[PDB]
Scaffold this active site. Structure first.
Site, PDB file in Angstrom:
ATOM      1  N   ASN B 186       0.788  -1.268  -0.010  1.00 11.62           N
ATOM      2  CA  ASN B 186      -0.220   0.018  -0.096  1.00 11.62           C
ATOM      3  C   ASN B 186       0.679   1.039   0.055  1.00 11.62           C
ATOM      4  OD1 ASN B 186      -1.863  -1.872   2.329  1.00 11.62           O
ATOM      5  ND2 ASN B 186      -2.369  -1.586   0.114  1.00 11.62           N
ATOM      6  N   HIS B 188       3.185   2.316   2.146  1.00 12.33           N
ATOM      7  CA  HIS B 188       3.331   2.804   3.321  1.00 12.33           C
ATOM      8  C   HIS B 188       4.794   2.057   3.807  1.00 12.33           C
ATOM      9  CE1 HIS B 188      -0.376   4.680   4.635  1.00 12.33           C
ATOM     10  NE2 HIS B 188      -0.819   4.019   3.709  1.00 12.33           N
ATOM     11  N   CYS B 223       5.933   7.100   9.424  1.00 13.78           N
ATOM     12  CA  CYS B 223       7.250   7.921   8.535  1.00 13.78           C
ATOM     13  C   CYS B 223       6.475   8.050   7.251  1.00 13.78           C
ATOM     14  CB  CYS B 223       8.378   7.442   8.719  1.00 13.78           C
ATOM     15  SG  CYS B 223       9.717   8.054   7.380  1.00 13.78           S
TER      16      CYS B 223
END
Ligand SMILES: Cc1nccn1Cc1cccc(C#N)c1
Ligand SMILES: Cc1nccn1Cc1cccc(C#N)c1
EC number: 3.1.2.14
Lengths: 264, 265
Positions: B186, B188, B223
Site C-alpha cells: 500500500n 506505506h 514516517c
C-alpha cells in the site's frame, strides 16, 4: 530444494511473501534477485562448498559479481509458488557464469531468466585475476560440459557494453546509505541493495504506469558500510534508462546499468 | 502453513535464508519481525479476511500497530527450520492483540515469543477510535475465548511504560530515509523498517559482543515515504539496556520510542 537427476543443476520452489510484493501485489525485482542469490547458495552447499573451493581457500581467492542481467515476463503474485532452476559454467580463464530460469509452478511456463558473470579476486588485496587450471578443473565436475545458456541468442542484451552517464543526469536520488539489513553475513553490502539504489532515481510515475522488463547492472567497485551513494538516471528512449551509482563525495563510480520498462 | 485443530491459531514453518542472517550466521531480529508479519498475514487469509472485517471496510477502518514486543532466547541459524504459532485476542474496546511463539522445529524447544497491540483507525482522517460491538463480535469467532498470553508474567516487560529520551542523546544515526524496498503493497513504510532504524544508533561494538534479547517499540506516528528520520539512543544500564527515540529530522516530531536489552555473548 534439490539437485536435478544428473547433478548438474539445482531447483527450488518459493512461496511469495506478503512483505516481498510491491503495489501490484507481485514480487519486486529485488525479491526476485534475493531468491536468485538464495537458490545459488543452496546449489553451492549441495555440491560440497562450505562458493570457494579448496584451492581458492588456500590462495585466499573469492568470487565477486561483475555483472547481473535479469529479464522478467511475469512477476509472481503474493501467495504464488515460483520454481527456480540454476546452474554454473566455466568461461575459461575469464571467470564463471551462473544462470537461472524462473517458472510458474502451476503452469510450468517460463516467467523469467537471469545470468551473472563472476570474476576471481584476492580477498585481501582486492586484485582481480584470471582463473587457474586447478580451480577450473575442480569446478568443472559440477557444471554441464556442453554450453547451456539462459540467454543463447548471439549479440543478446546480457552481453551489451554499458556507457557512462554524462552530467547533468535527468533524475537523481542522493545521500543513499546502507543500514545493517543491507549487509550480508560478512558485513559487506548485499548485491541486491545496489539494484534497489539504481531504481531509486526512476520517477514514481514510470513505476506506477510501467513494469520493469529488463535490468543489466555492472559492478565496478564495492560500497563500504560507511560510504554514501548518489543514484543517477537519464531516459535514453517502451521506456529505457541509463543508470549510474557513484560515491556522494568524490564521485567514484560503483555501478552502471540500463533498464527497459513496458507500459502496463 | 495451516490453522491448528481447533481453528483458533495458525502455524507455519520457515527455512532461514542466506540473506536473512547477520555476522553470527543466525537470523536478524528484522528477519524474525518479517516472519511474524508473514505468519500473521497467512492466519488472517486462512480465516477469510482481506485483516479488515466486513463492518471495518464499510466504515473505512483499519488496524494499526501501537506496540511490538519481541523476546528471543536463540536466533535460528541459516538453513534451520523455525516453527511459528500465532493467534489473536480481543482486548475489549481498547483494540486487539496478536501473539506469537517461535520454536526450533527439530527439538520443539521455545526459542522466542512476541506480542503486539493494535488499535482501530479511520483510514482517511487517521483518527483513532474504540472497537465497536459489531467489530468485536465479528472477530471473536476466530479468537480463543479464555485468555492465552505469550507473556503471562505479573508485571512483565511487554506492558511497561517507555519514557521519552532527553537531548543530548549518547549515540545517533541521522538522515535515515526509506527506499522502495522499505514500503509495503500500500506504499506505506513497513513496520519492520522502524526496528532497523532504531537499531542503527546502537554502536557496532555492542552488536559485535552482545546478542539482542528483548526489544519493545511504541509506534506514535507514521514516517511518510518522503520523510527523513533521526535515530537516537542512550545507555540506561553482564546486560546492557538502552532507551531509543526515532524523530523526524527537521522539526523533531516523535515517530517511535523503545527500549532494548542485550546479553553479553
Ligand atoms: C550502524 C551502521 N549502519 C551501517 C553501517 N553501520 C556501522 C557498521 C560498522 C561496521 C560493521 C557493520 C556491520 N555489520 C556496521
Ligand atoms: C523513489 C522513492 N524512494 C522512496 C520513496 N520514493 C518515492 C515514492 C513516492 C510515492 C510512492 C512511492 C511508492 N511506493 C515512492
Amino acid at each position: 530444494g534439490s539437485l536435478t537427476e544428473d547433478g548438474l543443476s539445482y531447483k527450488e520452489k518459493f512461496v511469495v511473501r506478503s512483505y516481498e510484493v510491491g503495489s501490484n501485489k507481485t514480487a519486486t525485482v529485488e525479491t526476485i534477485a534475493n531468491l536468485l542469490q538464495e537458490v545459488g547458495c543452496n546449489h553451492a552447499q549441495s555440491v560440497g562448498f562450505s562458493a570457494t573451493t579448496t584451492t581458492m581457500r588456500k590462495l585466499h581467492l573469492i568470487w565477486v559479481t561483475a555483472r547481473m542481467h535479469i529479464e522478467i515476463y511475469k512477476y509472481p503474485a503474493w501467495g504464488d509458488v515460483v520454481e527456480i532452476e540454476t546452474w554454473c559454467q566455466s568461461e575459461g580463464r575469464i571467470g564463471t557464469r551462473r544462470d537461472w530460469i524462473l517458472k510458474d509452478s502451476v503452469t510450468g511456463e517460463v516467467t523469467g531468466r537471469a545470468t551473472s558473470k563472476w570474476v576471481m579476486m584476492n580477498q585481501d588485496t582486492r586484485r582481480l585475476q584470471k582463473v587457474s587450471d586447478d580451480v577450473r578443473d575442480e569446478y568443472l565436475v559440477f557444471c554441464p560440459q556442453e554450453p547451456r545458456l539462459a540467454f543463447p541468442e548471439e549479440n543478446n542484451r546480457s552481453l551489451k557494453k554499458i556507457p557512462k552517464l554524462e552530467d547533468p543526469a535527468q533524475y537523481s536520488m542522493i545521500g543513499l546509505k546502507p543500514r545493517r539489513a543491507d549487509l550480508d553475513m560478512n558485513q559487506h553490502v548485499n548485491n541486491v541493495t545496489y539494484i534497489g539504489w539504481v531504481l531509486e532515481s526512476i520517477p514514481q510515475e514510470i513505476v506506477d504506469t510501467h513494469e520493469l522488463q529488463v535490468i543489466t547492472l555492472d559492478y565496478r567497485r564495492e560500497c563500504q558500510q560507511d560510504d554514501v551513494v548518489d543514484s543517477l538516471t537519464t531516459t535514453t528512449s517502451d521506456s529505457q534508462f541509463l543508470h549510474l551509482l557513484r560515491l556522494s563525495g568524490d564521485g567514484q563510480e560503483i555501478n552502471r546499468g540500463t533498464t527497459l520498462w513496458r507500459k502496463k
